Amino acid sequence: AKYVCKICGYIYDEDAGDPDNGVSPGTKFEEIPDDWVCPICGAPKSEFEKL
Ligand SMILES: [Fe+3]
C-alpha cells in the first residue's frame, strides 16, 4: 500500500520502505515505529492518508 503525507506530498510506499531512517522494504505502515516521521517535512504518522 501507499500513503501520502498530507503536508508535503511525500508518498510512503510499503514496497520501498525508508532505509535511510531504519525502515526496510516491505514494512507495513502500521509496523513503522510511532516516532518515525515524514523524511521530507517531519510530519508525524497521524498526517498520512492511505491511497
Ligand atoms: Fe511530509
From Swiss-Prot:
Q: How does activity depend on temperature?
A: Extremely thermostable, being unaffected after incubation for 24 hours at 95 degrees Celsius.
One annotated GO molecular function is:
iron ion binding
BP term (GO), one: alkane catabolic process
Which residue windows are transmembrane per the record?
none
Describe how the cofactor binds: Binds 1 Fe(3+) ion per subunit.
A single Pfam family it belongs to is Rubredoxin
**Listed cofactors:** Fe(3+)
Residue sites binding Fe cation per the record: C5, C8, C38, C41
Q: Which UniProt keywords apply?
A: Electron transport, Iron, Metal-binding, Transport
> Gene3D superfamilies per the record?
2.20.28.10
Q: Which domain of life is it from?
A: Archaea
Tell me the protein family, please.
Belongs to the rubredoxin family.
Stored NCBIfam families: RubredRD (NF045768)
Return the protein name: Rubredoxin
